[PDB]
Design a protein around this nucleic acid. Structure first.
Ligand SMILES: [Mg+2]
Ligand SMILES: [Mg+2]
Ligand SMILES: [Mg+2]
Ligand SMILES: [Mg+2]
Ligand SMILES: [Mg+2]
Ligand SMILES: [Mg+2]
Ligand SMILES: [Zn+2]
Lengths: 196, 52, 205, 190, 147
RNA sequence: AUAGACAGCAGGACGGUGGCCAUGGAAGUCGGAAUCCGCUAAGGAGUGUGUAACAACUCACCUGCCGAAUCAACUAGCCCU
């Protein structure tokens, strides 16, 4: 029953925030079920992975502001795909290791690249490709001894901008993705405190 | 051969359509009822056949 | 061949059954009136759907056969070859006549038997399907298809009775617990609180 | 039923001037002036505000059908606001399998001559609607740029070109040849 | 050169063809050879199709065998096998115990799949009703009794 | 359905398991019956496209943006075919 599911979801989140006053808020978007699952099996007996609608998140805070008045500042802040993960014991050790929890995946499409990634010049063993794209964009690619080599070190991508479709497709073929889908930290709550 | 984006653009006006099973009228791909009074605006619609 | 069904649609004659005064009647097209799981116990198929006639007309034996096949075929597709039980509640007993005109006139015009029809009343049930509750939508849809084999208007009515019995579904379970409804094969037997006390003794023994 | 009141309000940019002569809407902007007459629809048009203008369309006691024209008028007015600010740019692409379609523009974008469509010795003379200028794209080949202030005139001009290049007596699933509208946009980008 | 392939074989029974022949023939090992050496690696399963994962390197290769969720059926259930032509509607089922369901769960816990015992016990019990097997009666009654 | 619907714009749509029988092939998707469970926001013994089988896409289901009603079936008047 949807009503029972909703009420069960409402009651379990209230008791969970009561149990753990230390939490990390993350953005779990473009990851899927396996990614939140994979975190779960790794952090099976240390932390819990939970989320849902922003509506019941704000309703839980409304229903518990009387017990904890330090939650009033989170009402408009909570936005997007929330990734509530709750800890109890450690602060800096969990912060580093969760920051270290990344899962390699396919090439991102639309996820901005705040940094430039250089491609080492080495043979990859591919068939013929049109050089009109390289000539127009201004990248010198030479066909030597069957493979392709680049002459001058040219920044292939722009830093801190929207990623282009051509770059994403080019990265997808070479199967080396510097940026991978996973859990990103955005905010922390601990007895009404904010930290980076 | 026709470039694929131009291949698709021309198909949007020639191929990707719906056909009435009473008056054969060409209809937009999201049609649910025919627009022709001669069939009584029937819901008997089928996709336009593809060459493939 | 057969005349079009429009020639015998209306109950124009007195009932003319196959009898000692009406010989040489060809056998009706419909012979199997019950199909599906006839054996299923009363409690297995509680949901019942009826096709109810809304006209006082004649339904030919061929028409009854076609609807039976049409409803059966779909129910096997939607619920299984044993997820229901279909009973045709009309038996063609009215013999229609034909005065064969082969190249004399209306002299001696009393015709010969041609076939059989089922004189249906407004509100008489034409065919019934009993299945599980979870298959109500299919029974309406199956009966919807069989409607196109009959002349006139028909209505599909989900009965509030339990299965093919004459007892309400909402109280059927209570009467069974109180031994006023003993499951007897397809249907049930009503236990009147009368008759020798020995029968009450066995029931409660 | 008959609904008592149904209104939709459209905003007006600071650089756009709209005057009403009854149900006639005159929209003036940087790119020019557009006039439309709405005498076929029994509605009430009002201008609201002085520091920032705002046009409201009112309909009293309308049936389901009369109710539908309220948004129709508002969309038409917003198109007129779009036309006089940014204009309309309908880009057409010529698709051909074997015979290239040769388009030459004459009379300053007023006449479009189409040659070698399907190999035919027939030259198609397509006259643009007034206020619509057709040109051949210089950035990309096989592309036509239709520019004008009235979406209806620009889009009808594109439709005239598109139905000029029609394949007859041939399987149109193959033989995908003609000039087709590929992009609908504006002369200026906001 | 390192290569990893993960294919399913019938195991004890030998089939005419599979999905591996176009993939194993080119590398150097015939589909018949790799079919037979895996078949003898199974040995006792006979009926069910066993999945095999193997790694191929420059010169030689190694193979390993993974079982199903609950494949200990022939030894636990005393039934005579049918012909190689199989049979029409076998509808196989019987009775099962408790010591072997935990043992495979214990071996599963060694392989660390999904979660731990408290939830994975119902995993095997649910599958047992799917095939038709029973732990000394219907599983729903057993599930209520243990919780 | 204001604990956020409907529309639209976007992500997930999982493990047992390729559930059982059958079939040369049948891995959710030729056929007949079963239609159950840790894992959450959800993910089915699958609404379709697709493969020899796969794979792949996609649907229900659910989440982000959004901010008031909306969806399905049926019925009978006039009108239309
Ligand atoms: Mg008479
Ligand atoms: Mg009828
Ligand atoms: Mg021809
Ligand atoms: Mg054309
Ligand atoms: Mg109507
Ligand atoms: Mg008429
Ligand atoms: Zn039509």
């Amino acid at each position: 029953d949807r009503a029972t599911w909703k009420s069960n979801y409402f009651l379990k989140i209230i008791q969970l925030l009561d149990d753990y006053p230390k939490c990390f808020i993350v953005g779990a978007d473009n990851v899927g079920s396996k990614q939140m699952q994979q975190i779960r099996m790794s952090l099976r007996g240390k932390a819990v992975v939970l989320m849902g609608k922003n509506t019941m998140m704000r309703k839980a805070i409304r229903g518990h502001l009387e017990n904890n008045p330090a939650l009033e500042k989170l009402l408009p802040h909570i936005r997007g795909n929330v990734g509530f993960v709750f800890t109890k014991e450690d602060l800096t050790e969990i912060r580093d290791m969760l920051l270290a929890n990344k899962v390699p995946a396919a090439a991102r499409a639309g996820a901005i690249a705040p940094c430039e990634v250089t491609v080492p010049a080495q043979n990859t063993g591919l068939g013929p490709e049109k050089t009109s794209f390289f000539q127009a964009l201004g990248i010198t690619t030479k066909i030597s001894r069957g493979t392709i080599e680049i002459l001058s070190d040219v920044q292939l991508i722009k830093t801190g901008d929207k990623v282009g479709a051509s770059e994403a497709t080019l990265l997808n073929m070479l199967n080396i993705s510097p940026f991978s889908f996973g859990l990103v930290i955005q905010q922390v709550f601990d007895n009404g405190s904010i930290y980076n | 051969i026709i470039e694929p984006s131009l291949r698709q653009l021309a198909q949007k006006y020639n191929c990707d359509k719906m056909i009435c099973r009473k008056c054969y009228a060409r209809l937009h791909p999201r049609a649910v009822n025919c627009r022709k009074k001669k069939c009584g605006h029937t819901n008997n619609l089928r996709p336009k056949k593809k060459v493939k | 061949g057969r005349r079009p069904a429009r020639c015998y649609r209306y109950c124009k004659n007195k009932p003319y059954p196959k009898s000692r005064f009406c010989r040489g009647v060809p056998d009706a097209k419909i012979r199997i009136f019950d199909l599906g799981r006839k054996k299923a116990k009363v409690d297995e198929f509680p949901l019942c759907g009826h096709m109810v006639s809304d006209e006082y007309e004649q339904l030919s034996s061929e028409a009854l056969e076609a609807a039976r096949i049409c409803a059966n075929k779909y129910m096997v597709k939607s619920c299984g070859k044993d997820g229901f039980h279909i009973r045709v509640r009309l038996h063609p007993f009215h013999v229609i006549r034909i005065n064969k005109m082969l190249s004399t006139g209306m002299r001696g015009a009393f015709g010969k038997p041609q076939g059989t029809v089922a004189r249906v009343h407004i509100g008489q049930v034409i065919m019934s399907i009993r299945t599980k509750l979870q298959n109500k939508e299919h029974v309406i849809e199956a009966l919807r298809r069989a409607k196109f084999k009959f002349p006139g208007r028909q209505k599909i009515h989900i009965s509030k009775k339990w299965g093919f019995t004459k007892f309400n579904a909402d109280e059927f379970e209570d009467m069974v617990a109180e031994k006023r409804l003993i499951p007897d094969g397809c249907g049930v037997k009503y236990i009147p609180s009368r008759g020798p006390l020995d029968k009450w003794r066995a029931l409660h023994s | 039923m008959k609904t008592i009141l149904s209104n939709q309000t459209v905003d007006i940019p600071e650089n756009v001037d709209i005057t009403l002569k009854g149900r006639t809407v005159i929209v003036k902007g940087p790119r020019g002036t557009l006039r439309r007459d709405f005498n076929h629809i029994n509605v009430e048009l009002s201008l609201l505000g002085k520091k920032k203008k705002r046009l409201r369309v009112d309909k009293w006691w309308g049936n389901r059908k009369e109710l539908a024209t309220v948004r129709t008028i508002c969309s038409h007015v917003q198109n007129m606001i779009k036309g006089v600010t940014l204009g309309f740019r309908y880009k057409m692409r010529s698709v051909y399998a074997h015979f290239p379609i040769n388009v030459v523009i004459q009379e300053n974008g007023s006449l479009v001559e189409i040659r070698n469509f399907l190999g035919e010795k027939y030259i198609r003379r397509v006259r643009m609607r007034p206020g619509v200028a057709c040109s051949v794209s210089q950035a990309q080949k096989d592309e036509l740029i239709l520019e004008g202030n009235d979406i209806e005139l620009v889009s009808n001009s594109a439709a005239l070109i598109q139905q000029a290049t029609t394949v007859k007596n041939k399987d149109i699933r193959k033989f995908l040849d003609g000039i087709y509208v590929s992009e609908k946009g504006t002369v200026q980008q906001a | 050169e390192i290569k990893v392939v993960y294919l399913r074989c019938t195991g004890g029974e030998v089939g005419a063809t599979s999905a591996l022949a176009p993939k194993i023939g080119p590398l150097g090992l015939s589909p018949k050879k790799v079919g037979d050496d895996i078949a003898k690696a199974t040995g006792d399963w006979k009926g069910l199709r066993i999945t095999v994962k193997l790694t191929i390197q420059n010169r030689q290769a190694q193979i390993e065998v993974v079982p199903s969720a609950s494949a200990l059926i022939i030894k636990a259930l005393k039934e005579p096998p049918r012909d190689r032509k199989k049979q029409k509607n076998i509808k196989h089922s019987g009775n099962i115990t408790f010591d072997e369901i935990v043992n495979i769960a214990r071996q599963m816990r060694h392989r660390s799949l999904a979660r731990e015992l408290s939830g994975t016990i119902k995993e095997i019990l649910g599958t047992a009703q799917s095939v038709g097997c029973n732990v000394d009666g219907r599983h729903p009654h057993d599930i209520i009794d243990d919780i």
